[PDB]
Amino acid sequence: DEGMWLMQQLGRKYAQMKERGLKMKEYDLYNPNGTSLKDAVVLFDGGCTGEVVSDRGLVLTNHHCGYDMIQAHSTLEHNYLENGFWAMREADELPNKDISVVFIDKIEDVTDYVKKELKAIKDPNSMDYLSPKYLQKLADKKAGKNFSAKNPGLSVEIKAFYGGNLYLMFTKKTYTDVRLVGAPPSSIGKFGADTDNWIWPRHTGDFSIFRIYADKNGNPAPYSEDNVPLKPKRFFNISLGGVQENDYAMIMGFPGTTHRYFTASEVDEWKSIDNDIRIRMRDIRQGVMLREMLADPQIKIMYSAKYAASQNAYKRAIGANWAIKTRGLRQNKQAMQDRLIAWGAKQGTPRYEEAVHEIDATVAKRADLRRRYWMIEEGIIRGIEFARSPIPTEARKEAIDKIRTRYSKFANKDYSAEVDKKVAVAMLTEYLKEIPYENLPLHLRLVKDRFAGDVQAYVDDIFARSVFGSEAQFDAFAAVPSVEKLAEDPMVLFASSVFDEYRKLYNELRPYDDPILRAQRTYIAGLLEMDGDQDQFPDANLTLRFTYGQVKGYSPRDNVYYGHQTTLDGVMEKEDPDNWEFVVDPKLKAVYERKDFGRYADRSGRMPVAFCATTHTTGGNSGSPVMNANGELIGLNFDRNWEGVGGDIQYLADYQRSIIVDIRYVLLVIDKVGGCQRLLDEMNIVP
Amino acid sequence: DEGMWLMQQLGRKYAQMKERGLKMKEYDLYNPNGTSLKDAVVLFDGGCTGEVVSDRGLVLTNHHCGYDMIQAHSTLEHNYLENGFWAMREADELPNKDISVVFIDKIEDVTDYVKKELKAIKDPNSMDYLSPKYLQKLADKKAGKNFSAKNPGLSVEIKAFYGGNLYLMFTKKTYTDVRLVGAPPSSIGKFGADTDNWIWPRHTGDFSIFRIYADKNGNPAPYSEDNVPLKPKRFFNISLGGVQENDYAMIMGFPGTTHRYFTASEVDEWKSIDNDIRIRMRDIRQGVMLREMLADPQIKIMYSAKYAASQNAYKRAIGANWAIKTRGLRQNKQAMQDRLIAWGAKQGTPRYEEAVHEIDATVAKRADLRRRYWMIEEGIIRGIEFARSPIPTEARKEAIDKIRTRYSKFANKDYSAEVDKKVAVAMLTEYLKEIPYENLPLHLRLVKDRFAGDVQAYVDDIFARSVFGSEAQFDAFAAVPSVEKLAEDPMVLFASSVFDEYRKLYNELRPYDDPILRAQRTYIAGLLEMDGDQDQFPDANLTLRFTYGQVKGYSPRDNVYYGHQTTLDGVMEKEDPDNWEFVVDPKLKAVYERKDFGRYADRSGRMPVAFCATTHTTGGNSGSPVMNANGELIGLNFDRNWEGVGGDIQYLADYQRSIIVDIRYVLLVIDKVGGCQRLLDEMNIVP
Ligand SMILES: [K+]
Ligand SMILES: [K+]
Ligand SMILES: [K+]
Numbered sequence A, B: 001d002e003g004m005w006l007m008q009q010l011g012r013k014y015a016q017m018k019e020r021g022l023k024m025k026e027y028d029l030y031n032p033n034g035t036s037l038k039d040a041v042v043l044f045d046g047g048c049t050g051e052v053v054s055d056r057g058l059v060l061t062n063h064h065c066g067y068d069m070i071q072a073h074s075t076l077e078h079n080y081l082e083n084g085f086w087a088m089r090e091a092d093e094l095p096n097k098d099i100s101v102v103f104i105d106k107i108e109d110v111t112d113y114v115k116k117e118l119k120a121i122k123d124p125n126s127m128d129y130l131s132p133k134y135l136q137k138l139a140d141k142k143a144g145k146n147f148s149a150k151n152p153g154l155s156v157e158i159k160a161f162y163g164g165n166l167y168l169m170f171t172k173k174t175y176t177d178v179r180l181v182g183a184p185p186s187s188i189g190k191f192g193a194d195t196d197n198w199i200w201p202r203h204t205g206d207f208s209i210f211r212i213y214a215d216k217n218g219n220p221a222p223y224s225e226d227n228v229p230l231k232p233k234r235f236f237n238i239s240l241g242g243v244q245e246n247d248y249a250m251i252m253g254f255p256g257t258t259h260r261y262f263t264a265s266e267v268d269e270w271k272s273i274d275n276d277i278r279i280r281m282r283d284i285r286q287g288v289m290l291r292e293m294l295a296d297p298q299i300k301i302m303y304s305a306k307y308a309a310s311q312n313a314y315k316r317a318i319g320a321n322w323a324i325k326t327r328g329l330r331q332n333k334q335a336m337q338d339r340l341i342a343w344g345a346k347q348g349t350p351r352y353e354e355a356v357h358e359i360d361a362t363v364a365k366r367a368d369l370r371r372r373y374w375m376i377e378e379g380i381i382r383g384i385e386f387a388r389s390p391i392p393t394e395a396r397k398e399a400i401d402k403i404r405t406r407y408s409k410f411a412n413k414d415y416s417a418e419v420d421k422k423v424a425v426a427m428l429t430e431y432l433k434e435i436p437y438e439n440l441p442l443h444l445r446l447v448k449d450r451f452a453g454d455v456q457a458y459v460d461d462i463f464a465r466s467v468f469g470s471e472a473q474f475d476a477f478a479a480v481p482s483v484e485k486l487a488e489d490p491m492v493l494f495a496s497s498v499f500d501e502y503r504k505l506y507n508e509l510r511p512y513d514d515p516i517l518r519a520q521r522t523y524i525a526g527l528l529e530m531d532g533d534q535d536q537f538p539d540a541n542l543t544l545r546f547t548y549g550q551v552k553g554y555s556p557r558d559n560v561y562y563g564h565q566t567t568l569d570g571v572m573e574k575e576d577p578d579n580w581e582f583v584v585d586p587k588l589k590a591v592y593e594r595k596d597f598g599r600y601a602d603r604s605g606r607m608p609v610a611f612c613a614t615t616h617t618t619g620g621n622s623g624s625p626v627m628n629a630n631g632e633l634i635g636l637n638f639d640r641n642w643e644g645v646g647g648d649i650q651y652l653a654d655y656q657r658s659i660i661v662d663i664r665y666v667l668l669v670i671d672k673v674g675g676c677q678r679l680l681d682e683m684n685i686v687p
């Protein structure tokens, strides 16, 4: 069901959640002065979510969340990334540098305090009401000086909500000794990772396991061997009961951003500039890279990761545009604003209509600038590798060595000048079609002026004459440098020129953000006064939220249905030993052959892998705990389907799903692949 | 349900069909001396099936069955292929040249007659028992001379069944005045034709409509304006009732071939030679053609149809190999033979085991020859266009003009020498890898002997020096011919050489067919004696058969389900104006926008397009009538899904489907797109 809800909003949603199957008492989910299930949810390393699952501080998160830590502890000799890692006793758990887990100890509405303090600011158009600096000053003031000394490991922050109409103060408890406990092999943690990115059905065992360490009274402490596991105030019980179609499910985590209060003019802008340009430009770049990778197996090895990276936001854009085209996104936002405008007229209050028209005006006014910026960003800054070639400055020589370092990083083991030329020719062709001469970065005027419109000639010239055009040409330069040659170097001139245009566009565009922000404060205030907050969630902003719904599949298209649950049978169907992403771990294969599923499979002997649910999630919900009607953990959220990515603007009940690793599968992999029984023994596994 | 059943087998199947929902009395479906629904089924133009659907001789078949006739009547001015054709009165229906519809008037078991006549042949290894010549002589003898003069439009044929263990005599009634009445536009008749070939879900309105004309007493007659519509003895009533999941369905038509009595050694041969080679070689050829078509829009236009043609049997091979790998085809055939062998031992009869071992021996013995033949056939004869360049023979000049005609047909508006070179280089690379020097067509030895292993050099030389290497080079030749030059021409020598090897392989392989055939007579006799015919259908052989089952979807893979029914919503989802195969006709679009579905949609207002069923069909079932439990027409068969193509060897209950145009959609397109009300009025449309 729709919405990423504040914890303060639980009372307002509780009836709707019970109608969907919630059985918990409200107080047990969240409450302000006691212990609640909220106390088992953590912000894992500043972006991802995780969850406490034992009375000795075991934390579950996604493999993709744990990846960097697993990587860091890997050596080609103990390659934990590839083989999995299973500590067989607490003493074998691996400390990590610059990691943290954050608990949300307390939440308090401070809207009256902040609004009163804002009256001091004379200028009605000051943006201090959204300023992190300003808000931190208010938080610090409110908590007292010495707060910190009287509160081991606690800090405070104030955040804006509802466009500046509501403020909460959070009290955070931060732990920095968080040790790696367990991880599956990558073939399990990243199964289908690229090819199945954004896809349901999904077959990835995307998990990893950490443990919070602390002082002997459970306070935060920097890493020390005298530290001991945290004995947390609350942890999740783990359900063995599984899921069935239509079961209630809920998620708590830290979603980053949403745009629920877009005007119709902002939807049209997101379609026709940001998405349309990203889709066009990336389809060009990718098409060239594909052709090259298919022609040459060394190019495949060099460019596969850059290709997959480009594909990630491309696939998102595709999905968003599908939603705008087929699911009525614009009309939804149009109806929202027409309702408020007609109401405002009844109240004799034209300020809401003025706000919408101000947003409309600003969006109209920036259109050509924003189009220029997205063209350069997608076409060149991200599009063309040689845009990010070295730009100098700067008797010696030390500077040559400094340039050499940047050059080697540019033209590294994954870079092909020949691939980059082909990509640049195609990208610059489209770029020059769309951007008129008068608005080109200056160096690109040379295509018309010096090369007679021949982009291939132009790009061939940059590489022929640049000191960065090849290692040979770099070495000839240093060796025998020239100040001179460098000042005129066509690659340096290209790179300088495009980054100059990028910067100027950025700087001209930035001022347009503020009138929109100011107008949205008024717009959202309107919407709330008129209809209330019960069916109007605040946009995500990296803070703790809950969402609820049901375990359920969907129909992507006529006569096709995806169910709610994948199985280990589906892993085996996808097996491909010659594709790294569809390798099946030999222990798991052996498990499937023997049906050695223990107590983790369903009564018909099918072993679950993942499931999907109608919860409303976005980026920042990776790793989030998925709870059943009684608050027990039934899975770990890891993705969302491409059909649903338009959900950041308008929730799509019939298409949008969260993609979730089944906790039964997590347990299976712990048990049968890891052989880490002690982790099972320390959890409270319930029927 | 499994099987393509003889009409004589209806009694044996009738209980199983009733358990699936059949409500008809047996006699009304088929009977030997009266009128039955069998009398409404026709063999349409010697391969396809069709059905009589009015009392004035209206015949429904597939668009793909009618295509050639529609094409022939099209001029660029009246382009019926593109716009549809709808005759608005009988006088406007278009006669066709060299067309026929065949009714199966009578069927008679003649097994005793044929076996008695075969005793005359002294040689136990004579293949007269399967000879069309020999069998026609027996048919002619049995019917009497003068049969024909005493029986307007009737002819007789005898066919072998069950490997020569059963013989039927058919009495055929042939009509040759069959006029085009109606056809949808191609965008409807071929919607998704290439991209959705072998695919369910499917959205194609694949139909066309003819009318049988005859003399005034309804006898066959060649085309004349005095001819009148046939008043047939039986026609299908058309149901408006629709279909629902699990409804009974049955089909009658003329399936071509199946291989239900393969030994396990024959399955392994079909996998490892015929399919594996076809998949490998076509994936090469297609990969090259794709790369070229994507690079160049004129090449796309020239090669798209050749690419789609290659893809047709490729996709089939893929599907068959999937079935051999995942669905147990070999083990099924292994179990069949082990059952018979163990039974034969109990009966003191070793001849069944000897038969299986003889088939095994023959398959082992031909393995390298058959591998060579498939390599040359897939790699070169079909693989490389210049294999089919002109080979001469032959004061004038007339012969030059004859060569010019063949050359122009070779290097036509769809041929690119540059594409053909690239394909040849890749195909010949794989070919030379697989076939050792000693077994090469002689000219290809030159790659090692004259070009130092360089296939590109070799192919470049053929085109450089051949008189067929370009139009320029052809014109220089004739102009100034040379006998001489032609005798040495490297393309002519290549073409001669490969066809010589092809022919020699073919001739050496042919004798191996007979011992297998002879052994299969014995093998099948065994199987029938042991278990009877109730669950052992005779292989298809182009004769009239029935099949039964239910309206039902399937799960292609874990967590995905395809339903039983597509809708017009699915057509609209696939719309793409810039792809000829996904163009939506403007009248049909307008129908969908207005929901102008008349009485043809379901009670929820969704308009059906196609459905699928568990019937057992193959090539020759195109156009076949699909009947409900009461014998009413509910659809027209048009394809089968790729998952099910292994069904020619072993029926796959959980995957194999027939793909069927919903008759409700046929009516809709007649009515709302064609505007051909009189065709509706002449049918007997029942609730
Ligand atoms: K994703
Ligand atoms: K987001
Ligand atoms: K087909």
Ligand SMILES: [K+]
Binding pocket: B256, B257, B258, B618, B619, B648
């Ligand atoms: K067949």
